[PDB]
Every structure is written in structure tokens, then in C-alpha cells.
Write a protein that binds this ligand. Structure first.
Ligand SMILES: [Ca+2]
Length: 223
């Protein structure tokens, strides 16, 4: 996250880190056995880390649970990043309290202008590299479909939305991928892509979760 703020330990209790020897993507906990992330985060050898604040220090709230099954969306296209969403089933159910908690799925698609919270352990610089040890947070609005399509002509599908600032300076970034965009207490987006980070006229693009609720609910019910 570029231009954001230190969230505070366990203020984002649905946030997960996906770890394959090191942190490589975020995710969101949607119930005690399932995590949602980006299909472009797919890897074998995934451990899910819950209740994390500092990813380099075991502080006490953490649960580390291996994945038993991964399900990339059946129509995911790695060239266009259309349908950039994946589900990960945990080997055992997480213990849910106040510092590990699930986030609800939306029942409606959120409007342009809605303020959302984005979080992750990704790069904090628009030029160069600095990865934080603690979770960063960013408040950003959803942009209109027309401003999104003008920032990225011919690249935005009905399964994506833009959020952030056209003036640049504040954005998600590499290493935030797969992580949550939460608006009005629901998971509306998944960190997906963008051109660099926090560049003028190049806001972040997110998977539009409201389009996938049926697939998610049916998949969870059957696996
Ligand atoms: Ca930790």
C-alpha cells in the first residue's frame, strides 16, 4: 500500500497472508474454512496465516493453517486478468474471535463514490522498493465506470472496478494482490492489477466480488 497508514494490530481481522516460505499475496477470510484471493496469486505449497500484524514476528494472535484445496475461477484469463479470483479451503477450521473474524459477502454491487478500506503488506513506494513488516491500510473511493475505462481504454471488463485517486500518490501495490477491498462492512473487491502503483491517471483495478457471490456460495457448499 502506497500513501496509506499503519492499520493497527488486529483492526482488519479478516485479512490473511498467503505464505510459501515468505509472504506473497493477501486474502480474505470469508468463513472458518475458506479464504478468497486473486487467481493470479495461485501457487502450490500455500500456508494461510491468520491474526497477523507483523509478518516477521510471532506476537500471539496467529493461526497458521495449510491449504487443502485451491479453486481458481473456471474462466480466469491470465492475459486480461478477467475473473481474477480464487478460493482456498483450509485443512482445519480457523478459531474465530475478535482478532480473527470473517468478512461478509455483498448482496449488492457498491456505487461510485463509496468509501472503501484496502489493506495489505505490499510495497509502499511508487518508485523503488520498501516492504513493510506491519499491515498498512488505505481509504479510497470507488471510481465511476467511465473514469475507469478512460484510465484503461479497452482493458476494463464488467468484472472489474477502479478505486483510488486519479491524481496518484495513494494506491495498492505489488504484494497487496489478493487482499480485501471492504465497503460498508462487506467484501466488495479483490486487489487485482494496475499500471505501476500510485501513478497519475492509473488507479488500482479490483475484481468485482458482487459478480461472483453465486459461484462462491455454490463452491463452498459443495467442497
Ligand atoms: Ca506475526
Amino acid at each position: 500500500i502506497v500513501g496509506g497508514y499503519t492499520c493497527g494490530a488486529n483492526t482488519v481481522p479478516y485479512q490473511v497472508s498467503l505464505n510459501s516460505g515468505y509472504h506473497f499475496c493477501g486474502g480474505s477470510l470469508i468463513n472458518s474454512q475458506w479464504v478468497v484471493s486473486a487467481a493470479h496469486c495461485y501457487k502450490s505449497g500455500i500456508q494461510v496465516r491468520l491474526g497477523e500484524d507483523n509478518i516477521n514476528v510471532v506476537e500471539g494472535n496467529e493461526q497458521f493453517i495449510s491449504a487443502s484445496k485451491s479453486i481458481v475461477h473456471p474462466s480466469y484469463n491470465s492475459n486480461t486478468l478477467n475473473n481474477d479470483i480464487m478460493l482456498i479451503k483450509l485443512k482445519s477450521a480457523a478459531s474465530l474471535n475478535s482478532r480473527v473474524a470473517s468478512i461478509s459477502l455483498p448482496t449488492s454491487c457498491a456505487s461510485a463514490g463509496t468509501q472503501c478500506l484496502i489493506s495489505g503488506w505490499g510495497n509502499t513506494k511508487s518508485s523503488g522498493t520498501s516492504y513493510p513488516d506491519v499491515l498498512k491500510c488505505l481509504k479510497a473511493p470507488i471510481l465511476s465506470d467511465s473514469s475507469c475505462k478512460s484510465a484503461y481504454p479497452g482493458q476494463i471488463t464488467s468484472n472489474m472496478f477502479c478505486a483510488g485517486y486519479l491524481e496518484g500518490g495513494k494506491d495498492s501495490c505489488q504484494g497487496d494482490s489478493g487482499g480485501p477491498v471492504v465497503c460498508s462492512g462487506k467484501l466488495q473487491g479483490i486487489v487485482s492489477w494496475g499500471s505501476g502503483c500510485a501513478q497519475k491517471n492509473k488507479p488500482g483495478v479490483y475484481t468485482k466480488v458482487c459478480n461472483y457471490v453465486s459461484w462462491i456460495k455454490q463452491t463452498i457448499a459443495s467442497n
